[PDB]
Amino acid sequence: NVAHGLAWSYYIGYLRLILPELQARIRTYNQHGAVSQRLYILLPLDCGVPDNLSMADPNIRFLDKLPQQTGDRAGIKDRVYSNSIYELLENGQRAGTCVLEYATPLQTLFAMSQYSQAGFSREDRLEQAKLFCRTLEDILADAPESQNNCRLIAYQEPSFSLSQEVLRHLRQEEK
Amino acid sequence: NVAHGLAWSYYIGYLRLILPELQARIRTYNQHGAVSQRLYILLPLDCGVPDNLSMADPNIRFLDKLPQQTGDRAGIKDRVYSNSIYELLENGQRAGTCVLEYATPLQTLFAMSQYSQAGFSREDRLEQAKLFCRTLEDILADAPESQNNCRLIAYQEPSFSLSQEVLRHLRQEEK
């Protein structure tokens, strides 16, 4: 169960740090369209994570970054936590604006399957992704750092539109 | 074996990326004392990782940062990889200059032991650290990205001087 340790590292190293500061960082960008106050984490179950999000879906477009976050982590002075704001389109229209990013450890799982001494078979990527998502979902439930600031988007492709999948979660929070 | 997955994530997510660019980034700082061309990663086996390195040892002092590194990681535009340069002192003298940082996943292991649903007992921190160091050492041996650009410093405290432990590795590379 590699995913278990990566899920915790994902919370302890990243979400536990950025989420409490997240809501303050978003409304700082607005004052300086409208951006949603939740962090949207894409969780593809096939464990493939493009680097450029715009090449995952043409309807997902990059707009601008957030004001960064600084902190001293394990001796590194002012380690930089940055996030990107993406606009999702429908039929050439702007259907919403939010901070959107993949879950990096999914990409790392994909990499581990290729390396020989990782001892991780490529057939287990799908099951480890399911464990990663389920484990993380258990974290954010009891996570004091996370209260209505985060939504995990998990999907398994069978042609697929990722923009519509995100917009679905987006329009449900509008209710 | 949580450490196994974290060791691979440490290589795939961080060292595999920064090491090939590392030697070029150091000699760029010099042209712009002298800094060593190796990245020094502290690996305390008790899994305790201070955030401010200067409070680990008074003889370890912060000097300046390196020119940063940019890349698009899992949808985040220009994710920032930064590093800090530290000066190590002996009897009020500057005994060397190099980039020095703890291994972050050691800090995460320490955190996981505290959380209830992590299923990770605090008695296993020492054994998981040993696994993390040994696993990582196996990675960097066959790692094409790492050739004489990195040295792992592992130590187990019994009063302890961390500066002397680092300087030992530093003076051996001078040979």
Ligand SMILES: Nc1ncnc2c1ncn2[C@@H]1C[C@@H]2CO[P@@](=O)(S)O[C@H]3[C@@H](F)[C@H](n4cnc5c(N)ncnc54)O[C@@H]3CO[P@@](=O)(S)O[C@H]2[C@H]1F
């Ligand atoms: N700024 C950021 N932006 C976006 N996501 C982020 C994020 N910081 C964390 N996360 C997420 C949490 C997870 C574990 O974070 P953690 O700090 S406990 O363990 C890291 C660390 F030891 C080392 N490392 C990597 N980059 C860096 C770096 N710039 N400076 C220092 N050390 C680094 O490599 C390990 C694995 O990295 P990953 O990216 S594969 O997984 C990360 C990623 F999914």
